[PDB]
Symmetry: C3
Subunit: 252 residues, 3 copies
């Protein structure tokens, strides 16, 4: 199950039923969960954790040092991750806590780049060449389409869709679809929310969207919408708007 | 000619005068044609065929499984292919017939991605980072410039130019140039057709272009243009327009 | 310090305190300077020079043949280069002198592509997936943001900023910021010049910018601005404008 050509540094912790293919690399401080597959040439570097039932594809690099001139450290990836070929997930820095963190059920396609000190939730999907700059945060179920870069310190809420062939500089309210360059909120991510919620929550989210974005001060509108609000999903939108540190981009 | 470090699984079929460099990988079901070069680290996976006089460059991956959550299978590449570094050509699925197929004389530059169940004709050129989503079809002599993604199930006719730093969602009539995001037909691909045809065919194609695209219903205009038509190249445009499944994007 | 798995062809010249990790490749004509690190899988090919204290990261390819159908040769990289993962720096051709050249202090991030016969000065920064086509020249301190391609034979002057998620076809005057697709001069690169010069030079550059770009014939304006001019930095702008071979793109 471990190819003799694999370089597993003394100190690496490997779980049950792990498969390390030829010419892969695991570091002395690496922790490879149970039932994980590391394919030919992939490199798990630094103080990096790969959770159970993850698959790291050929030549993907997890735990390389940050891309930064001025420079305990690593990457933590949850369970059931898929990291496709040539992905570069860099470690964190002392401006965070030394760690880049990814939740469970990540699906990260080829050439994807996740920069130092990112924080991705669960069930994130990154399409080919999506690039997250430093300290980007993505909520659960966010999708980022292909060839789209996200500016450092950007937050994308849960259930967002950031379209491909776009470029994102500001924060994106939960359950919204953003597109363009600079990318802006166009609508709800209707596909994502119809997959997950009932027609009733969906309609609640549509009303909430119009109530927030149609006209007026977004923060004024979010506080008002919190009044007596029944839906925890509309609440996340509202609190996210109130808490925004980079502002929200909106299309007209 | 085969480096000892190369991993050639028992079952791999290798032709005459093949060169497999260090740390490359060939599968038990792979078929490597005569006079082929597989460079260091490249991986020929699954039930994949590489035709004669092809060159697969360092770390290019041919025959990896599709990028898809819900998941006999492979990739067939014709003769005289050039596949540059870090290219990802994924196998097909049972929604096609399990195969991704590329014709002869392919020139596929670095980081290029060809998704499951694509069908590329002959003398295709893909520039750096061009990305084809699932079930994309490209006719003979089509060029796709760099950093351009094509939406799944898109058909591009023969002799098209899809410009770089664009994004393509709809079908592209043969011999046309498309550009933008969303990308649209701007003109004929005048460079491509002047390389291949005489000034007379060229002028026939220019007239045909104006006759099809100037004003009016494109399908009405294509049937009319088929009337008594002398040129097989104008016929392909017309039939392609009539047969279109995703529609044709046109600029104004 | 050299892993046994590394392939160092007889003829390779290696300096003091060099580290070649597992599965890396150095050619018979390669010259690796002192205190250089070649990480796992990276390939130094052809008649290529890597200057002292450079770091080539996992799987980066330096000295591969040009991407060109119609085809002594190599790449020369100055001291203290950082070449991140999966970068493709191709050799030159006989249309130049066979060499692609990069000065000192280069910082080249993941998936970056430098095409045949490029000439990069010192302290260049290329962000993820920046792509230089053939014969591109970049002056000292130029930055090219991420996912931006530069058209072949383009010259970018010293201290330019070419923004990310853009596409560059024309020449860029020194100390300017360019953005868009096609990308155009928007302003000075105020961040770059405030890092390097005093408030006085900065203001001189701002005046010079307005004097050159506000209205009128750019060449007429550059000759006039050369009249009695005190600043060598304003002179470079002016001479560059006068010497331009592809023209200067300017925004309105
Ligand atoms: Cl690293
Ligand atoms: Cl695979
Ligand atoms: Cl090469």
């Amino acid at each position: 199950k471990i190819h003799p050509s694999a370089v597993i540094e003394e100190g690496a912790q490997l779980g049950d039923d792990v498969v390390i293919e030829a010419y892969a690399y695991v570091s002395k401080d690496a922790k490879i969960g149970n039932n994980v597959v590391i394919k030919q040439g992939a490199r798990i570097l630094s103080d990096t954790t790969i959770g159970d039932h993850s698959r790291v594809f050929s030549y993907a690099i997890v735990g390389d040092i940050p891309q930064d001139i001025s420079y305990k450290s690593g990457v933590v990836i949850g369970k059931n991750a898929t990291i496709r070929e040539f992905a570069t997930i860099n470690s964190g820095t002392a401006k965070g806590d030394g760690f880049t963190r990814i939740g469970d059920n990540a699906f990260i396609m080829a050439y994807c780049h996740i920069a130092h000190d990112c924080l991705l939730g669960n069930n994130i999907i990154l399409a080919n060449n999506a690039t997250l700059a430093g300290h980007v945060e993505l909520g659960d179920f966010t999708v980022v389409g292909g060839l789209t870069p996200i500016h450092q310190f950007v937050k994308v809420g849960e259930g967002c869709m950031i379209a491909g062939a776009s470029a994102l500089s500001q924060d994106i309210v939960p359950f919204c679809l953003a597109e363009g360059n600079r990318a802006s909120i166009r609508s709800l991510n209707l596909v994502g929310i119809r997959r997950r919620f009932d027609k009733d929550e969906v309609d609640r989210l549509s009303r909430a969207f119009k109530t927030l974005f149609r006209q007026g001060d977004l923060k004024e509108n979010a506080k008002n919408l919190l009044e007596n609000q029944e839906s925890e999903n509309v609440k996340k939108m509202c609190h996210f708007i109130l808490e925004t540190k980079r502002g929200i981009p909106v299309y007209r």
